[PDB]
Amino acid sequence: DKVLVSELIGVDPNPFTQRIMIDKGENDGVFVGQPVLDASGLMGQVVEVMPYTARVLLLTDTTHSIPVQVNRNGLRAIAVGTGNPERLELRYVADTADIKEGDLLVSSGLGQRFPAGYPVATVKEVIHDSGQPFAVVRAVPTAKMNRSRYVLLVF
Ligand SMILES: [Cl-]
Ligand SMILES: [Cl-]
Ligand SMILES: [Cl-]
Ligand SMILES: [Cl-]
Ligand SMILES: [Mg+2]
C-alpha cells in the first residue's frame, strides 16, 4: 500500500550482473527482499541495505527468476533473467501452449515474493522445439530497468 519513491543512483558495472543502486536505505525502512518496480513493470528486489542507500537485483540477472502468467489466459511460467539488460526467457511453457508475440506477462505472486497482477514483460519470440516438451519464449521487460527515473519500493 505505502509506496516510497527512490532515485536510481548507480548501475553495477560488473558485466555479469544486472544490479542497480537506489537512494533509500535502512533509515527509510527499506529491507532485503523488498520488491522494486517502475510505472511500467516490476524491476526486481532489494538484496542489500545500507543506511541511506540499497542494492537491487533486476529481473534480467541470470540468477533471478519470477513466477509470471500470460495476462489474457492465465498460462503460468517462470521468467528467468538472461544477463541481457532487455531480455527474459520463459521456462515450463508447453511447446503447444497458447502464447504469442505481444502477449503481456504479469507477476503471478506464486513465489510469495512479488505482488500479483503487475506487468513484467511482453513476449518477443516463440520458437518451437521438435522432441522437447517446452517451447523457447523470449520476452522484453516493460520496466525501464537500468534506465528508470522513479524506482518505487512497495511496503
Ligand atoms: Cl533487511
Ligand atoms: Cl496478454
Ligand atoms: Cl538473451
Ligand atoms: Cl512471487
Ligand atoms: Mg552489471
Numbering used by the authors: 100 to 254
What sentences appear in the manuscript?
The elongasome, or Rod system, is a protein complex that controls cell wall formation in rod-shaped bacteria. MreC is a bitopic protein that harbors a large periplasmic domain, whose most noteworthy characteristic is a β−sandwich core reminiscent of ‘butterfly wings’. MreC is essential for shape maintenance in rod-shaped bacteria, and mreC knockout mutants are not viable.
In order to allow unambiguous tracing of the MreCPa structure into the cryo-EM Coulomb potential map, we solved the high-resolution crystal structure of MreCPa(97-258) that harbors only the central β-sandwich core region.
